[PDB]
Amino acid sequence: SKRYFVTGTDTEVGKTVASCALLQAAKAAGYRTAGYKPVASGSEKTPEGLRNSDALALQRNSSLQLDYATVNPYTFAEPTSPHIISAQEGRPIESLVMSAGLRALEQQADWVLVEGAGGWFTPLSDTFTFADWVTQEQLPVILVVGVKLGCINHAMLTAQVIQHAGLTLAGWVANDVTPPGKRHAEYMTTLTRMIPAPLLGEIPWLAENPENAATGKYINLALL
Amino acid sequence: SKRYFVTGTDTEVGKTVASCALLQAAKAAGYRTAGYKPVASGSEKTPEGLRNSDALALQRNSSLQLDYATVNPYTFAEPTSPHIISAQEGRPIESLVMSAGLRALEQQADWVLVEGAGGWFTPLSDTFTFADWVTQEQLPVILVVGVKLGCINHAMLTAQVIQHAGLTLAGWVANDVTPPGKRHAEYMTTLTRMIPAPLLGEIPWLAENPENAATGKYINLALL
Ligand SMILES: Nc1ncnc2c1ncn2[C@@H]1O[C@H](COP(=O)(O)OP(=O)(O)O)[C@@H](O)[C@H]1O
Ligand SMILES: Nc1ncnc2c1ncn2[C@@H]1O[C@H](COP(=O)(O)OP(=O)(O)O)[C@@H](O)[C@H]1O
Ligand SMILES: C[C@@H]1NC(=O)N[C@@H]1CCCCCC(=O)O
Ligand SMILES: C[C@@H]1NC(=O)N[C@@H]1CCCCCC(=O)O
Ligand SMILES: [Mg+2]
Ligand SMILES: [Mg+2]
Ligand SMILES: [Mg+2]
Ligand SMILES: [Mg+2]
């Protein structure tokens, strides 16, 4: 069954919005989908415990009805780096637990999308990063590029490090985080030439609730 | 004579403010200093032609009185990627010209700081990046890290790519781009452990005109 890890050029560039588009496209293609956000920070209190908004978006965009903990085993209240809040709360983040959760989702889904947290190298402990886990799992990687000044550099940096870890950069998604600007077409051309993976699609600037917008149509899953 | 290239985790993270601090510290140490911004975009019209604000800051923080063109040979009006505006204006950016300017500054300065543009991989043409030129010149690199969420990932990405190009990462500067936040000390500890170079100093949050503030005192040039 298909598995992809979605990373971004930084936090707040559209990993979640693009992940929802990817999931919607996969459902459209007829897959039994599941989104997985193993580690999340910046969460709200509910009667059932802490709930993170990215995990909720992935959960509602999955074709299967998934229990929250299955989508997101590790939930932290404070929106800081996972290693910091994990250490302060005395709740270690374990590779084995993250991997077990991925396997559990594969029990019922045949197309699984895993969203990272922050950018490529987000630390999970003082000696282990998110990049370490993706490398262990050998997940093909999808890069979400927020189309904005500074994204060529971040996209190139992330792509190079991914390739140097021996991993497959399966594709990239262009996310229009801001309204159209002057050098939009030139930026798209530059990113397209420089990123060594297929451009899967471009998600337009959608001001209101992009996470629930019908954005599956912007992704060409046959290029994946 | 000493030469350093200053790069940043992105544009707008403090390359210029930190570069001024570095230059001020070097003047304090007794060096005959010069700042060099070979390529600049986002400039204002004057009677003498276009003038870029980073180049002006480097010029005024140099111990020597330097002509503007010597500090910044390539000046573009629009603040977009150098390769885009160079191509649209029909003004090619040449490695040879950038290198000649560096040599010219070495005629009178014994300590030269070269500020890049954007982040590490800013394109200068469709086939040549700023990273290519730094690699040709074999300049030791100073990384400016804007202390903010997302900087651990960008700092790690930039450091890894620099080391993989065979270059020396001579040090890093922590720049407080925003007022103090909750995980400041933890971020400093994490960056310190992860960046494989000496922390040269930390520039505090200085709301008003940081470029002309006396910030040389925040840099320990003996760690360089
Ligand atoms: N294409 C879009 N159009 C408009 N707003 C966007 C779009 N993509 C992202 N958003 C908004 O920008 C912010 C960051 O997007 P998100 O997908 O949560 O980023 P990340 O998951 O990388 O943290 C959110 O408020 C989101 O609603
Ligand atoms: N430590 C500082 N305190 C407060 N403001 C900062 C500081 N460093 C940078 N600035 C401001 O942030 C913006 C970006 O800094 P600059 O040095 O020009 O970044 P870059 O050269 O990487 O583009 C500028 O407006 C600058 O005046
Ligand atoms: C040099 C430009 N003018 C400026 O002051 N910052 C811009 C940085 C542009 C980055 C171009 C590549 C990228 O998007 O990463
Ligand atoms: C996961 C966190 N919560 C969130 O929504 N974004 C934050 C990203 C944190 C980045 C930590 C490493 C760095 O600073 O690069
Ligand atoms: Mg987010
Ligand atoms: Mg997200
Ligand atoms: Mg700037
Ligand atoms: Mg600058």
Side-chain angles (χ1 to χ4, degrees), chain A residues 9 78 83 88 120-121 126 153-154 156 160 182-183 190 193, chain B residues 9 78 83 88 120-121 126 153-154 156 160 182-183 190 193:
Chain A
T9 39
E78 186 190 329
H83 77 301
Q88 197 102 143
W120 186 245
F121 269 138
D126 283 353
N153 174 50
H154 293 151
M156 288 179 313
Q160 186 175 125
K182 189 188 160 132
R183 294 300 181 178
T190 300
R193 166 179 73 253
Chain B
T9 39
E78 186 190 329
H83 77 301
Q88 197 102 143
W120 186 245
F121 269 138
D126 283 353
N153 174 50
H154 293 151
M156 288 179 313
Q160 186 175 125
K182 189 188 160 132
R183 294 300 181 178
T190 300
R193 166 179 73 253

PDB file of all heavy atoms in Angstrom, chain A residues 9 78 83 88 120-121 126 153-154 156 160 182-183 190 193, chain B residues 9 78 83 88 120-121 126 153-154 156 160 182-183 190 193:
ATOM      1  N   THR A   9       8.734  23.616   3.408  1.00  0.00           N
ATOM      2  CA  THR A   9       9.927  24.474   3.414  1.00  0.00           C
ATOM      3  C   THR A   9      10.087  25.164   4.788  1.00  0.00           C
ATOM      4  O   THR A   9      11.123  25.770   5.083  1.00  0.00           O
ATOM      5  CB  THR A   9       9.819  25.519   2.304  1.00  0.00           C
ATOM      6  OG1 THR A   9       8.485  25.997   2.214  1.00  0.00           O
ATOM      7  CG2 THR A   9      10.196  24.961   0.928  1.00  0.00           C
ATOM      8  N   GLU A  78       1.452  23.066  23.997  1.00  0.00           N
ATOM      9  CA  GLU A  78       2.204  24.243  23.557  1.00  0.00           C
ATOM     10  C   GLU A  78       2.798  24.071  22.170  1.00  0.00           C
ATOM     11  O   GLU A  78       3.483  23.095  21.873  1.00  0.00           O
ATOM     12  CB  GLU A  78       3.303  24.565  24.575  1.00  0.00           C
ATOM     13  CG  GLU A  78       4.056  25.864  24.296  1.00  0.00           C
ATOM     14  CD  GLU A  78       5.275  25.980  25.200  1.00  0.00           C
ATOM     15  OE1 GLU A  78       5.204  25.461  26.335  1.00  0.00           O
ATOM     16  OE2 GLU A  78       6.289  26.571  24.781  1.00  0.00           O
ATOM     17  N   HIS A  83      10.665  18.325  20.756  1.00  0.00           N
ATOM     18  CA  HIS A  83      11.637  17.939  21.783  1.00  0.00           C
ATOM     19  C   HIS A  83      11.561  18.787  23.051  1.00  0.00           C
ATOM     20  O   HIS A  83      11.756  18.250  24.153  1.00  0.00           O
ATOM     21  CB  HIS A  83      13.051  17.922  21.209  1.00  0.00           C
ATOM     22  CG  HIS A  83      13.697  19.253  21.020  1.00  0.00           C
ATOM     23  ND1 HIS A  83      13.195  20.259  20.230  1.00  0.00           N
ATOM     24  CD2 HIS A  83      14.857  19.714  21.567  1.00  0.00           C
ATOM     25  CE1 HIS A  83      14.028  21.291  20.288  1.00  0.00           C
ATOM     26  NE2 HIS A  83      15.036  20.989  21.085  1.00  0.00           N
ATOM     27  N   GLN A  88       9.938  18.862  28.783  1.00  0.00           N
ATOM     28  CA  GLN A  88       9.359  19.590  29.910  1.00  0.00           C
ATOM     29  C   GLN A  88       8.200  18.812  30.523  1.00  0.00           C
ATOM     30  O   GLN A  88       8.006  18.868  31.741  1.00  0.00           O
ATOM     31  CB  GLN A  88       8.902  20.986  29.482  1.00  0.00           C
ATOM     32  CG  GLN A  88       8.677  21.947  30.633  1.00  0.00           C
ATOM     33  CD  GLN A  88       9.775  22.957  30.875  1.00  0.00           C
ATOM     34  OE1 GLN A  88       9.505  24.112  31.234  1.00  0.00           O
ATOM     35  NE2 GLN A  88      11.041  22.577  30.726  1.00  0.00           N
ATOM     36  N   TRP A 120      11.825  19.902   7.745  1.00  0.00           N
ATOM     37  CA  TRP A 120      12.503  18.628   7.675  1.00  0.00           C
ATOM     38  C   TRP A 120      13.174  18.173   8.951  1.00  0.00           C
ATOM     39  O   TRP A 120      13.019  17.018   9.385  1.00  0.00           O
ATOM     40  CB  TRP A 120      13.534  18.640   6.516  1.00  0.00           C
ATOM     41  CG  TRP A 120      14.185  17.316   6.284  1.00  0.00           C
ATOM     42  CD1 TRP A 120      15.501  17.018   6.450  1.00  0.00           C
ATOM     43  CD2 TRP A 120      13.544  16.103   5.871  1.00  0.00           C
ATOM     44  NE1 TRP A 120      15.721  15.689   6.173  1.00  0.00           N
ATOM     45  CE2 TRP A 120      14.539  15.109   5.802  1.00  0.00           C
ATOM     46  CE3 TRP A 120      12.221  15.771   5.557  1.00  0.00           C
ATOM     47  CZ2 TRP A 120      14.275  13.789   5.433  1.00  0.00           C
ATOM     48  CZ3 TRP A 120      11.972  14.462   5.169  1.00  0.00           C
ATOM     49  CH2 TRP A 120      12.968  13.484   5.129  1.00  0.00           C
ATOM     50  N   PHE A 121      13.937  19.058   9.578  1.00  0.00           N
ATOM     51  CA  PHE A 121      14.768  18.617  10.697  1.00  0.00           C
ATOM     52  C   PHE A 121      14.210  18.860  12.073  1.00  0.00           C
ATOM     53  O   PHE A 121      14.947  18.846  13.081  1.00  0.00           O
ATOM     54  CB  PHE A 121      16.098  19.253  10.383  1.00  0.00           C
ATOM     55  CG  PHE A 121      17.170  18.611   9.597  1.00  0.00           C
ATOM     56  CD1 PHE A 121      17.846  19.398   8.661  1.00  0.00           C
ATOM     57  CD2 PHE A 121      17.529  17.290   9.759  1.00  0.00           C
ATOM     58  CE1 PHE A 121      18.859  18.846   7.900  1.00  0.00           C
ATOM     59  CE2 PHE A 121      18.556  16.740   8.999  1.00  0.00           C
ATOM     60  CZ  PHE A 121      19.210  17.521   8.072  1.00  0.00           C
ATOM     61  N   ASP A 126      16.571  15.281  22.146  1.00  0.00           N
ATOM     62  CA  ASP A 126      17.872  15.919  21.986  1.00  0.00           C
ATOM     63  C   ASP A 126      18.824  15.149  21.080  1.00  0.00           C
ATOM     64  O   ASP A 126      19.900  15.647  20.707  1.00  0.00           O
ATOM     65  CB  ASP A 126      18.566  16.090  23.349  1.00  0.00           C
ATOM     66  CG  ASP A 126      17.983  17.240  24.138  1.00  0.00           C
ATOM     67  OD1 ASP A 126      17.137  17.968  23.567  1.00  0.00           O
ATOM     68  OD2 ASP A 126      18.376  17.409  25.316  1.00  0.00           O
ATOM     69  N   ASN A 153      15.247  29.101  -1.976  1.00  0.00           N
ATOM     70  CA  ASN A 153      16.329  28.654  -1.102  1.00  0.00           C
ATOM     71  C   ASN A 153      15.856  27.514  -0.197  1.00  0.00           C
ATOM     72  O   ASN A 153      16.468  26.451  -0.157  1.00  0.00           O
ATOM     73  CB  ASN A 153      16.851  29.805  -0.221  1.00  0.00           C
ATOM     74  CG  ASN A 153      17.870  29.373   0.816  1.00  0.00           C
ATOM     75  OD1 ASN A 153      18.858  28.687   0.554  1.00  0.00           O
ATOM     76  ND2 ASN A 153      17.642  29.755   2.076  1.00  0.00           N
ATOM     77  N   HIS A 154      14.723  27.710   0.486  1.00  0.00           N
ATOM     78  CA  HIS A 154      14.258  26.639   1.383  1.00  0.00           C
ATOM     79  C   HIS A 154      13.918  25.372   0.615  1.00  0.00           C
ATOM     80  O   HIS A 154      14.199  24.266   1.086  1.00  0.00           O
ATOM     81  CB  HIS A 154      13.081  27.121   2.238  1.00  0.00           C
ATOM     82  CG  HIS A 154      13.499  28.194   3.205  1.00  0.00           C
ATOM     83  ND1 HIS A 154      12.639  29.176   3.642  1.00  0.00           N
ATOM     84  CD2 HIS A 154      14.690  28.456   3.786  1.00  0.00           C
ATOM     85  CE1 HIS A 154      13.275  29.971   4.483  1.00  0.00           C
ATOM     86  NE2 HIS A 154      14.533  29.565   4.574  1.00  0.00           N
ATOM     87  N   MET A 156      15.277  24.343  -2.226  1.00  0.00           N
ATOM     88  CA  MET A 156      16.534  23.713  -2.633  1.00  0.00           C
ATOM     89  C   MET A 156      17.261  23.031  -1.486  1.00  0.00           C
ATOM     90  O   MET A 156      17.799  21.945  -1.647  1.00  0.00           O
ATOM     91  CB  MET A 156      17.456  24.750  -3.296  1.00  0.00           C
ATOM     92  CG  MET A 156      16.917  25.114  -4.672  1.00  0.00           C
ATOM     93  SD  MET A 156      17.873  26.345  -5.576  1.00  0.00           S
ATOM     94  CE  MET A 156      18.152  27.608  -4.339  1.00  0.00           C
ATOM     95  N   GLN A 160      17.852  19.008  -1.308  1.00  0.00           N
ATOM     96  CA  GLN A 160      19.193  18.446  -1.278  1.00  0.00           C
ATOM     97  C   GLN A 160      19.388  17.508  -0.090  1.00  0.00           C
ATOM     98  O   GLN A 160      19.947  16.426  -0.244  1.00  0.00           O
ATOM     99  CB  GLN A 160      20.290  19.514  -1.281  1.00  0.00           C
ATOM    100  CG  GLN A 160      21.681  18.892  -1.402  1.00  0.00           C
ATOM    101  CD  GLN A 160      22.779  19.931  -1.527  1.00  0.00           C
ATOM    102  OE1 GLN A 160      23.731  19.919  -0.742  1.00  0.00           O
ATOM    103  NE2 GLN A 160      22.633  20.786  -2.529  1.00  0.00           N
ATOM    104  N   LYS A 182       3.590  39.842  -8.407  1.00  0.00           N
ATOM    105  CA  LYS A 182       4.283  40.104  -9.641  1.00  0.00           C
ATOM    106  C   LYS A 182       5.144  39.010 -10.249  1.00  0.00           C
ATOM    107  O   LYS A 182       5.129  38.799 -11.474  1.00  0.00           O
ATOM    108  CB  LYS A 182       5.229  41.317  -9.389  1.00  0.00           C
ATOM    109  CG  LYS A 182       5.847  41.816 -10.673  1.00  0.00           C
ATOM    110  CD  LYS A 182       6.915  42.878 -10.486  1.00  0.00           C
ATOM    111  CE  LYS A 182       7.794  42.952 -11.727  1.00  0.00           C
ATOM    112  NZ  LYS A 182       8.009  44.341 -12.204  1.00  0.00           N
ATOM    113  N   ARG A 183       5.969  38.331  -9.451  1.00  0.00           N
ATOM    114  CA  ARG A 183       6.850  37.320 -10.076  1.00  0.00           C
ATOM    115  C   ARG A 183       6.368  35.884  -9.897  1.00  0.00           C
ATOM    116  O   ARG A 183       7.169  34.944  -9.879  1.00  0.00           O
ATOM    117  CB  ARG A 183       8.256  37.512  -9.522  1.00  0.00           C
ATOM    118  CG  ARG A 183       8.937  38.820  -9.903  1.00  0.00           C
ATOM    119  CD  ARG A 183       9.103  39.005 -11.396  1.00  0.00           C
ATOM    120  NE  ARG A 183       9.783  40.274 -11.701  1.00  0.00           N
ATOM    121  CZ  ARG A 183      10.095  40.656 -12.933  1.00  0.00           C
ATOM    122  NH1 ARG A 183       9.812  39.900 -13.985  1.00  0.00           N
ATOM    123  NH2 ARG A 183      10.713  41.827 -13.105  1.00  0.00           N
ATOM    124  N   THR A 190      11.160  28.745 -11.865  1.00  0.00           N
ATOM    125  CA  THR A 190      12.412  28.502 -11.158  1.00  0.00           C
ATOM    126  C   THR A 190      12.285  27.291 -10.241  1.00  0.00           C
ATOM    127  O   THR A 190      13.156  26.426 -10.228  1.00  0.00           O
ATOM    128  CB  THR A 190      12.846  29.719 -10.317  1.00  0.00           C
ATOM    129  OG1 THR A 190      13.012  30.830 -11.206  1.00  0.00           O
ATOM    130  CG2 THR A 190      14.158  29.460  -9.582  1.00  0.00           C
ATOM    131  N   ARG A 193      12.188  23.998 -12.347  1.00  0.00           N
ATOM    132  CA  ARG A 193      13.482  23.585 -12.858  1.00  0.00           C
ATOM    133  C   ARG A 193      14.367  23.015 -11.753  1.00  0.00           C
ATOM    134  O   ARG A 193      15.064  22.017 -11.952  1.00  0.00           O
ATOM    135  CB  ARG A 193      14.209  24.787 -13.502  1.00  0.00           C
ATOM    136  CG  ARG A 193      15.686  24.492 -13.735  1.00  0.00           C
ATOM    137  CD  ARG A 193      16.457  25.617 -14.384  1.00  0.00           C
ATOM    138  NE  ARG A 193      16.724  26.770 -13.510  1.00  0.00           N
ATOM    139  CZ  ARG A 193      16.051  27.908 -13.704  1.00  0.00           C
ATOM    140  NH1 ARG A 193      15.123  27.955 -14.653  1.00  0.00           N
ATOM    141  NH2 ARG A 193      16.271  28.971 -12.946  1.00  0.00           N
TER     142      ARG A 193
ATOM    143  N   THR B   9      19.479  32.160   7.532  1.00  0.00           N
ATOM    144  CA  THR B   9      18.520  31.050   7.436  1.00  0.00           C
ATOM    145  C   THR B   9      17.400  31.391   6.427  1.00  0.00           C
ATOM    146  O   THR B   9      16.602  30.531   6.041  1.00  0.00           O
ATOM    147  CB  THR B   9      17.923  30.763   8.814  1.00  0.00           C
ATOM    148  OG1 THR B   9      17.679  31.980   9.503  1.00  0.00           O
ATOM    149  CG2 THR B   9      18.850  29.919   9.695  1.00  0.00           C
ATOM    150  N   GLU B  78      14.141  46.270  -8.269  1.00  0.00           N
ATOM    151  CA  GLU B  78      13.089  45.416  -7.715  1.00  0.00           C
ATOM    152  C   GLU B  78      13.630  44.368  -6.759  1.00  0.00           C
ATOM    153  O   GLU B  78      14.552  43.617  -7.071  1.00  0.00           O
ATOM    154  CB  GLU B  78      12.309  44.751  -8.854  1.00  0.00           C
ATOM    155  CG  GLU B  78      11.089  43.954  -8.398  1.00  0.00           C
ATOM    156  CD  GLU B  78      10.523  43.136  -9.550  1.00  0.00           C
ATOM    157  OE1 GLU B  78      10.642  43.602 -10.703  1.00  0.00           O
ATOM    158  OE2 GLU B  78       9.977  42.042  -9.308  1.00  0.00           O
ATOM    159  N   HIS B  83      18.447  36.484 -10.158  1.00  0.00           N
ATOM    160  CA  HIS B  83      18.342  35.939 -11.514  1.00  0.00           C
ATOM    161  C   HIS B  83      17.141  36.463 -12.297  1.00  0.00           C
ATOM    162  O   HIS B  83      17.254  36.670 -13.516  1.00  0.00           O
ATOM    163  CB  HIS B  83      18.365  34.413 -11.485  1.00  0.00           C
ATOM    164  CG  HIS B  83      17.098  33.748 -11.061  1.00  0.00           C
ATOM    165  ND1 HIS B  83      16.484  33.941  -9.847  1.00  0.00           N
ATOM    166  CD2 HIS B  83      16.337  32.859 -11.759  1.00  0.00           C
ATOM    167  CE1 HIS B  83      15.392  33.188  -9.807  1.00  0.00           C
ATOM    168  NE2 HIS B  83      15.280  32.527 -10.944  1.00  0.00           N
ATOM    169  N   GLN B  88      15.390  40.014 -16.749  1.00  0.00           N
ATOM    170  CA  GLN B  88      14.412  40.959 -17.285  1.00  0.00           C
ATOM    171  C   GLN B  88      15.087  42.257 -17.714  1.00  0.00           C
ATOM    172  O   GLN B  88      14.658  42.870 -18.696  1.00  0.00           O
ATOM    173  CB  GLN B  88      13.307  41.241 -16.265  1.00  0.00           C
ATOM    174  CG  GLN B  88      12.058  41.864 -16.856  1.00  0.00           C
ATOM    175  CD  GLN B  88      10.891  40.928 -17.072  1.00  0.00           C
ATOM    176  OE1 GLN B  88       9.728  41.313 -16.887  1.00  0.00           O
ATOM    177  NE2 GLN B  88      11.131  39.690 -17.495  1.00  0.00           N
ATOM    178  N   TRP B 120      21.118  30.791   1.399  1.00  0.00           N
ATOM    179  CA  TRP B 120      22.245  30.126   0.785  1.00  0.00           C
ATOM    180  C   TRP B 120      22.160  29.950  -0.714  1.00  0.00           C
ATOM    181  O   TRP B 120      23.118  30.244  -1.453  1.00  0.00           O
ATOM    182  CB  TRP B 120      22.481  28.751   1.462  1.00  0.00           C
ATOM    183  CG  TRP B 120      23.712  28.054   0.981  1.00  0.00           C
ATOM    184  CD1 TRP B 120      23.765  26.881   0.296  1.00  0.00           C
ATOM    185  CD2 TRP B 120      25.065  28.502   1.124  1.00  0.00           C
ATOM    186  NE1 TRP B 120      25.069  26.571  -0.006  1.00  0.00           N
ATOM    187  CE2 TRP B 120      25.888  27.542   0.503  1.00  0.00           C
ATOM    188  CE3 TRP B 120      25.651  29.625   1.717  1.00  0.00           C
ATOM    189  CZ2 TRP B 120      27.279  27.652   0.444  1.00  0.00           C
ATOM    190  CZ3 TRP B 120      27.036  29.715   1.674  1.00  0.00           C
ATOM    191  CH2 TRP B 120      27.834  28.765   1.033  1.00  0.00           C
ATOM    192  N   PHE B 121      21.027  29.463  -1.200  1.00  0.00           N
ATOM    193  CA  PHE B 121      20.962  29.081  -2.610  1.00  0.00           C
ATOM    194  C   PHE B 121      20.353  30.092  -3.543  1.00  0.00           C
ATOM    195  O   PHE B 121      19.938  29.761  -4.673  1.00  0.00           O
ATOM    196  CB  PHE B 121      20.299  27.729  -2.549  1.00  0.00           C
ATOM    197  CG  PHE B 121      21.020  26.445  -2.443  1.00  0.00           C
ATOM    198  CD1 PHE B 121      20.504  25.484  -1.568  1.00  0.00           C
ATOM    199  CD2 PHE B 121      22.154  26.161  -3.172  1.00  0.00           C
ATOM    200  CE1 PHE B 121      21.140  24.264  -1.433  1.00  0.00           C
ATOM    201  CE2 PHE B 121      22.785  24.929  -3.041  1.00  0.00           C
ATOM    202  CZ  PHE B 121      22.277  23.991  -2.170  1.00  0.00           C
ATOM    203  N   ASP B 126      20.067  31.442 -14.404  1.00  0.00           N
ATOM    204  CA  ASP B 126      19.354  30.171 -14.466  1.00  0.00           C
ATOM    205  C   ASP B 126      20.250  28.957 -14.262  1.00  0.00           C
ATOM    206  O   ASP B 126      19.767  27.821 -14.114  1.00  0.00           O
ATOM    207  CB  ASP B 126      18.654  30.007 -15.827  1.00  0.00           C
ATOM    208  CG  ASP B 126      17.394  30.837 -15.917  1.00  0.00           C
ATOM    209  OD1 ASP B 126      17.012  31.429 -14.880  1.00  0.00           O
ATOM    210  OD2 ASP B 126      16.797  30.889 -17.018  1.00  0.00           O
ATOM    211  N   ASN B 153      15.283  24.186  12.037  1.00  0.00           N
ATOM    212  CA  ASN B 153      15.271  23.482  10.756  1.00  0.00           C
ATOM    213  C   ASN B 153      16.099  24.240   9.716  1.00  0.00           C
ATOM    214  O   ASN B 153      17.001  23.677   9.103  1.00  0.00           O
ATOM    215  CB  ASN B 153      13.836  23.312  10.222  1.00  0.00           C
ATOM    216  CG  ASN B 153      13.766  22.725   8.824  1.00  0.00           C
ATOM    217  OD1 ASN B 153      14.365  21.706   8.485  1.00  0.00           O
ATOM    218  ND2 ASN B 153      13.022  23.387   7.933  1.00  0.00           N
ATOM    219  N   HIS B 154      15.838  25.543   9.562  1.00  0.00           N
ATOM    220  CA  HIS B 154      16.603  26.291   8.551  1.00  0.00           C
ATOM    221  C   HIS B 154      18.086  26.331   8.885  1.00  0.00           C
ATOM    222  O   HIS B 154      18.928  26.230   7.989  1.00  0.00           O
ATOM    223  CB  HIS B 154      16.023  27.697   8.363  1.00  0.00           C
ATOM    224  CG  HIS B 154      14.646  27.654   7.760  1.00  0.00           C
ATOM    225  ND1 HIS B 154      13.696  28.617   8.010  1.00  0.00           N
ATOM    226  CD2 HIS B 154      14.056  26.748   6.951  1.00  0.00           C
ATOM    227  CE1 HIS B 154      12.592  28.325   7.346  1.00  0.00           C
ATOM    228  NE2 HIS B 154      12.779  27.179   6.707  1.00  0.00           N
ATOM    229  N   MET B 156      19.810  24.047  10.557  1.00  0.00           N
ATOM    230  CA  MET B 156      20.369  22.724  10.275  1.00  0.00           C
ATOM    231  C   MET B 156      20.534  22.448   8.789  1.00  0.00           C
ATOM    232  O   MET B 156      21.533  21.883   8.367  1.00  0.00           O
ATOM    233  CB  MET B 156      19.499  21.632  10.918  1.00  0.00           C
ATOM    234  CG  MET B 156      19.683  21.649  12.429  1.00  0.00           C
ATOM    235  SD  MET B 156      18.707  20.440  13.341  1.00  0.00           S
ATOM    236  CE  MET B 156      17.081  20.624  12.614  1.00  0.00           C
ATOM    237  N   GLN B 160      24.160  21.940   7.011  1.00  0.00           N
ATOM    238  CA  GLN B 160      24.501  20.695   6.343  1.00  0.00           C
ATOM    239  C   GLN B 160      24.960  20.929   4.907  1.00  0.00           C
ATOM    240  O   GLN B 160      25.950  20.347   4.473  1.00  0.00           O
ATOM    241  CB  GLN B 160      23.361  19.673   6.362  1.00  0.00           C
ATOM    242  CG  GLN B 160      23.802  18.326   5.788  1.00  0.00           C
ATOM    243  CD  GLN B 160      22.729  17.260   5.904  1.00  0.00           C
ATOM    244  OE1 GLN B 160      22.358  16.649   4.899  1.00  0.00           O
ATOM    245  NE2 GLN B 160      22.279  17.046   7.132  1.00  0.00           N
ATOM    246  N   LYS B 182       8.878  32.852  25.321  1.00  0.00           N
ATOM    247  CA  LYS B 182       8.951  31.768  26.264  1.00  0.00           C
ATOM    248  C   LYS B 182      10.062  30.742  26.124  1.00  0.00           C
ATOM    249  O   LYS B 182      10.666  30.320  27.126  1.00  0.00           O
ATOM    250  CB  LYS B 182       7.610  30.978  26.162  1.00  0.00           C
ATOM    251  CG  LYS B 182       7.487  29.948  27.258  1.00  0.00           C
ATOM    252  CD  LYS B 182       6.294  29.020  27.119  1.00  0.00           C
ATOM    253  CE  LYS B 182       6.520  27.758  27.941  1.00  0.00           C
ATOM    254  NZ  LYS B 182       5.351  27.394  28.780  1.00  0.00           N
ATOM    255  N   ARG B 183      10.326  30.251  24.913  1.00  0.00           N
ATOM    256  CA  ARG B 183      11.364  29.201  24.810  1.00  0.00           C
ATOM    257  C   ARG B 183      12.709  29.708  24.303  1.00  0.00           C
ATOM    258  O   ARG B 183      13.478  28.961  23.690  1.00  0.00           O
ATOM    259  CB  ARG B 183      10.818  28.083  23.929  1.00  0.00           C
ATOM    260  CG  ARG B 183       9.633  27.317  24.502  1.00  0.00           C
ATOM    261  CD  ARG B 183       9.931  26.633  25.819  1.00  0.00           C
ATOM    262  NE  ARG B 183       8.757  25.895  26.311  1.00  0.00           N
ATOM    263  CZ  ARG B 183       8.766  25.168  27.421  1.00  0.00           C
ATOM    264  NH1 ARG B 183       9.857  25.057  28.167  1.00  0.00           N
ATOM    265  NH2 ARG B 183       7.648  24.535  27.783  1.00  0.00           N
ATOM    266  N   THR B 190      19.411  24.496  21.910  1.00  0.00           N
ATOM    267  CA  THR B 190      19.242  23.576  20.792  1.00  0.00           C
ATOM    268  C   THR B 190      20.088  24.014  19.602  1.00  0.00           C
ATOM    269  O   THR B 190      20.779  23.201  18.997  1.00  0.00           O
ATOM    270  CB  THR B 190      17.771  23.474  20.344  1.00  0.00           C
ATOM    271  OG1 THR B 190      17.004  23.009  21.461  1.00  0.00           O
ATOM    272  CG2 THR B 190      17.600  22.507  19.177  1.00  0.00           C
ATOM    273  N   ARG B 193      23.875  23.343  20.307  1.00  0.00           N
ATOM    274  CA  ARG B 193      24.262  21.950  20.181  1.00  0.00           C
ATOM    275  C   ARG B 193      24.315  21.511  18.720  1.00  0.00           C
ATOM    276  O   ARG B 193      25.223  20.785  18.310  1.00  0.00           O
ATOM    277  CB  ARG B 193      23.257  21.047  20.930  1.00  0.00           C
ATOM    278  CG  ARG B 193      23.417  19.582  20.542  1.00  0.00           C
ATOM    279  CD  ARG B 193      22.479  18.636  21.255  1.00  0.00           C
ATOM    280  NE  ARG B 193      21.078  18.702  20.811  1.00  0.00           N
ATOM    281  CZ  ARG B 193      20.166  19.268  21.607  1.00  0.00           C
ATOM    282  NH1 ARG B 193      20.555  19.799  22.760  1.00  0.00           N
ATOM    283  NH2 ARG B 193      18.893  19.335  21.247  1.00  0.00           N
TER     284      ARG B 193
END
